[model samples]
Target: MGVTEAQYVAPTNAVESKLAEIWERVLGVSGIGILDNFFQIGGHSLKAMAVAAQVHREYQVELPLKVLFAQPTIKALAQYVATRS
Candidate 1:
């Protein structure tokens, strides 16, 4: 038999979930989908810094502001974190 095709799947963890929760709290919006863009939903530099700082304190993940700006979405940001971790 030939080798079976492989599928890619996103990984989930408490850190990621907690990260989303933090974002939701900071943004004052719930049901924030992972694919939703941060800036499009009213994310600013100050708030972004606050989120990043909390993430570092809680998750032990040092996510720089550039990464937040570069990803611009929870899904993309999660993927970046997954890769780093």
Candidate 2:
């Protein structure tokens, strides 16, 4: 057996919740599930670009479009955000 990382265990960690909040605000909905897919929840390419731009502003981390496409869910994108930091 192997030890798991702390970030992997939570739907939203301190680091992850930031990204999650952005989704909630932009989507104009509250109580967004961590498992929700961004695209499925009305996120388009332009919106994603907007998201990436805000992420850069807030976290100072750059998330490329390809990366976002690869991991479209909140949980998954949060995990990916963990890597860039």
Candidate 3:
């Protein structure tokens, strides 16, 4: 059997909660689910750019466009920050 990687869940950790907050501000929406896709929630490159900067200032991590484009979720980005910071 294959191992499961990701799941649709609420923010379960501090990092996830913080990332959700960042997404809320950047996307201008409240109640952002951790599993919600950033691009699907009114996110564009410009908004992603803003998020990247917010992440940098908050965690001092380099959330580049490529990573953000690929991950595109609060859960994923929170994991990225938790690992680096």
Candidate 4:
């Protein structure tokens, strides 16, 4: 048999979806899509701090505010959180 190559696959978990919902509620926005960027939606340092705090409080994970500012999207942040978890 010939050698076969494997491809990387990205998987989403239930926790990730829950976190996304929390983000949307905290950000005070509706119809928050996974691709929506946080800062692009008027998220600043204060908002970032709030988001981080909420995530820490609810998920028991200490996520840095800078990470959210840098990534600034549900899809990316969710994936990051999932990996950390």
Local distance difference test, each candidate: 0.46, 0.47, 0.49, 0.45
Q: By the lDDT metric, which is better: model 1 or model 2?
A: 2
- Model 4: which residue pairs collide? none
**What lDDT score goes with residue 70 in model 1?**
40
lDDT of 4 by residue, 2-65 (tens): 1122121122656546665565566534534344344333344365555654575464233444
For candidate 3, the per-residue lDDT at 75 reads 51
Give Cα distance to truth, residue 65, candidate 1, Å: 9.4
Q: Can you write out model 2's per-residue Cα lDDT over 1-85, one digit (the tens) per residue? A: 1212223323545645666566556663544434434433334445656566456546324344434433445456645553577
Tens digit per residue, CA lDDT, model 1, 1-85: 1112212112266654666666556663544434434432334446646466346545324344444434435446556653467
In candidate 1, list every pair of residues with a backbone clash. Answer: none
User: Against the correct fold, how does model 2 do in TM-score?
Assistant: 0.38
Superposed by TM-score, candidate 2 places the C-alpha of residue 82 at a distance from the truth, in angstroms, of 7.6
Clashes of 2: 0
Candidate 3: residue 80 lDDT (0-100): 69
Candidate topping lDDT: 3
